[PDB]
């Protein structure tokens, strides 16, 4: 089926770069005429499923030009001479159908110590063989850009790369819409929230998510995939399934509840938190007794000192709540404490966010500073973490009653949504 850029999501940078290619394909003369020479080989780099093959097709379809799809894993295991013969044929079929695009999927499988030499070299000859002015352009995709023989990277061949960057929230939204074209979605499904909740997800991750939501609905023999299926599909993909197996005693469930309710309260009360999306007391995957999902609302590229101080306080909210409520803190907060200490070090040692130490990068060449500076760093780190801690305990003391309500609900229902949470904290 024909494909254009409207069928690829979240790769705007790469598509803009590829827009010139489309033009060169559409009308080679416009370049040839003034000596603007095109690359003979373009290499798209990124993890599998980022649509690096879809993009190729999208570039041909966007200039209404032939597209010859080939795989670099097909040439592995071929008979002596067969691997080289296939390549010679492909390009012969390209020159005739030119202008066109010649794609080579999983190229790092061929461009990598025997017959693989003949096929690779044969490629190197075909590259050196065709005329770029003919409007012919070879592409290739590879999440394995280092395994490639440096010969293919030499001027005249694959001497250009177009970077295929991971999608932002809006790019993830479009990728979901696309993977959702032929799926029965319930009306309660909000792809914007699912996109918000999958930062770091690429196209192939997003496609798997959609499948996981379908496996979830199919499991219950249902005909529409629902917001529940998506939200649960995200949680499973990230933090594994839901270990409703293990037996947690009532006392430990209280501590877990308080701990989690602690994060959520402090996170909400504090000025710069990302809003809480959900609190769960349900164990998930490899040792994760509870957690608090946030729902971002941004796409921010800078972070401020106050925002990190607020995030630090929230990270200490769990333990603060334990201390204040039970007196006897548990090992549960170890990861919180390590995450918090790590932020403070970074503020003090890289971001120039302590007044004592100044706008200096201490560290990096590894530790390269005196013992006197080392103790000032620790002192500053301790003092930041400690203040955010007291500040968390004060939020706990002040919202004790609503904190109590929140763990009471959580112990009964195991989950509470952020709206309900904001509602309980507003008197």
Ligand X SMILES: CC(C)C[C@H](CC(=O)NO)C(=O)N[C@@H](Cc1ccc2ccccc2c1)C(=O)N[C@@H](C)C(N)=O
From the list Zn ion, its own copies, ligand X, none, partner contacted by residue 113 (C-beta under 5 to 8 A by kind): none
Residue-level length of the chain: 427
Annotated catalytic residue: which of 62, 106, 260, 322? Answer: 260
Residue showing tokens 């030009």: 65
Q: Which is nearer to ligand X, 129 or 199 (CB)?
A: 199
* DSSP structure class, residue 128: T
From the list ligand X, its own copies, Zn ion, none, partner contacted by residue 254 (C-beta under 5 to 8 A by kind): none
336 contributes a contact to Zn ion by CB under 5 A: yes
Closest C-alpha among 276, 280, 319, 271 to residue 295: 276
291 contributes a contact to ligand X by CB under 6 A: yes
Give the phi and the psi of residue 190 in degrees, each rounded to 5. -115, 100
Residues in region 68-107 near Zn ion by CB under 5 A: none
Q: Shortest gap between Cβ of 315 and ligand X (angstroms)?
A: 8
Tokens read off for 223:
């005909």
Helix axes 250-269, 371-398, angle to 10 degrees: 100
Q: Which is nearer to ligand X, 263 or 311 (CB)?
A: 263
Residues in region 261-280 near ligand X by CB under 6 A: 263
Tokens read off for 120:
């690779």
| Contact letters for ligand X, residues 112-131 (x by CB under 6 A) | --------------------
Q: After which residues does the chain break, using C–N > 2.5 Å?
A: 112, 364
| Contact letters for ligand X, residues 313-332 (x by CB under 6 A) | -----x------------xx
Cα 421 from chain centroid (whole Å): 28
244 contributes a contact to ligand X by CB under 6 A: no
Closest C-alpha among 140, 119, 138 to residue 76: 119
Closest C-alpha among 263, 264, 259, 237 to residue 248: 259
> Annotated catalytic, 260?
yes
Q: Shortest gap between Cβ of 402 and its own copies (angstroms)?
A: 23
Q: State the residues that interact with Zn ion by CB under 5 A.
A: 318, 336
Q: Catalytic amino acids?
A: 260
Q: State the residues that interact with ligand X by CB under 6 A.
A: 256, 259-260, 263, 287-291, 301-302, 318, 331-336, 350
């Amino acid at each position: 089926k024909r494909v254009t850029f409207k069928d690829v999501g979240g790769a705007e940078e790469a598509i803009e770069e590829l827009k010139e290619v489309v033009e060169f394909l559409k009308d080679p003369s416009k370049f040839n005429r003034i000596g603007a020479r095109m690359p003979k080989g373009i290499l798209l780099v990124g993890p599998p499923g980022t649509g690096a093959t879809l993009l190729a097709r999208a570039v041909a379809g966007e200039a209404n030009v032939p597209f010859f799809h080939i795989s670099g894993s097909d040439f592995v295991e071929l008979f002596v001479g067969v691997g080289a013969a296939r390549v010679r044929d492909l390009f012969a079929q390209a020159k005739a159908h030119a202008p066109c695009i010649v794609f080579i999927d999983e190229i790092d499988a061929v461009g990598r110590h025997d017959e693989r030499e003949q096929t690779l070299n044969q490629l190197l000859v075909e590259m050196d063989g065709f005329d770029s002015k003919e409007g012919i352009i070879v592409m290739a995709a590879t999440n394995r850009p280092d395994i490639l023989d440096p010969a293919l990277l030499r001027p005249g061949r694959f001497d250009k790369k177009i970077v295929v960057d991971p999608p932002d929230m809006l790019g993830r939204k479009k990728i979901l819409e696309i993977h959702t074209r032929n799926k029965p979605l319930a009306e309660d499904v909000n792809l914007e929230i699912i996109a918000k909740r999958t930062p770091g997800f690429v196209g192939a991750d997003l496609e798997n998510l959609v499948n996981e939501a379908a496996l979830l609905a199919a499991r219950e023999g249902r005909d529409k995939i629902t917001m529940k299926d998506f939200e649960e599909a995200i949680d499973r993909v990230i933090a594994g399934p839901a270990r409703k197996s293990l037996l947690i005693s009532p006392a430990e469930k209280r501590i877990i509840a308080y701990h989690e309710a602690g994060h959520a309260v402090v996170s909400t009360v504090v000025p710069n938190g990302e809003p809480v999306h959900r609190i769960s007391i349900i164990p998930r995957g490899y040792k994760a007794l509870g957690y608090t999902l946030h729902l971002p609302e941004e796409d921010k590229y800078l972070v401020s000192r106050n925002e990190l101080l607020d995030k630090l306080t929230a990270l200490l909210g769990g333990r603060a709540a334990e201390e204040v409520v039970f007196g006897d803190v548990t090992s549960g907060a170890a990861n919180d404490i390590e995450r918090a200490t790590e932020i403070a070090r970074n503020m003090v040692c890289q971001l120039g966010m302590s007044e004592e130490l100044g706008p200096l990068a201490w560290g990096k060449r590894l530790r390269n500073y005196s013992e006197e500076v080392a103790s000032k760093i620790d002192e500053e780190v301790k003092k930041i973490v400690t203040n955010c801690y007291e500040r968390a305990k004060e939020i706990i003391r002040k919202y004790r009653k609503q904190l109590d309500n929140i763990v009471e609900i959580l112990l009964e229902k195991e989950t509470i949504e952020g709206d309900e949470l904001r509602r309980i904290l507003s008197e």
